[PDB]
Amino acid sequence: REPSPPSIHGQPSSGKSFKLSITKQDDGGAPILEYIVKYRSKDKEDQWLEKKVQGNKDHIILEHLQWTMGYEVQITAANRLGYSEPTVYEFSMPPKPNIIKD
């Protein structure tokens, strides 16, 4: 197993959605077929949503992210091993934009 520290870059795509780029981390030792992403609300710690991605996607766009609520994101790359180089990313959302630019 050869993983490493986080590897997620969040950015304000469009609206409240955030682009969390999955940066190809050191694979456990086998090519990843799909990425299992699970995220939840920081306020609520009793549920975990699911989001699957293609090992070639290397990115995901999440929608419906209120400006007054944060949510944790957990990336898990699934290779022949099953799961490796997981990324536990966490970040709250900023207040409603006043410049509606970024």
- Domain positions in the chain are 1-102
Tally of CB atoms within 10 A around 87: 21
End-to-end CA distance of the chain: 39
Tell me which amino acid residue 8 is.
I
Tokens of 35: 């990425």
Could you give the CA distance from residue 62 to residue 22 in angstroms, rounded to a whole number?
Answer: 13
Place of tokens 């992210």: 65
Nearest Cα neighbor of 13 from 93, 90, 89, 76 is 93
H or E element that contains 20: strand 18-22
Residue 68 contacts residue 93 (beta carbons within 8 Å) = yes
DSSP at 19: E
The widest CA-to-CA distance across the chain, in whole angstroms, is: 47
Please give the CATH architecture assigned to the domain spanning 1-102.
Sandwich (2.60)
Q: Please provide the DSSP assignment of 30-77 as one string.
A: S--SEEEEEEEESS--S--EEEEEETTT--EEE----TT--EEEEEEE
H or E element that contains 88: strand 84-91
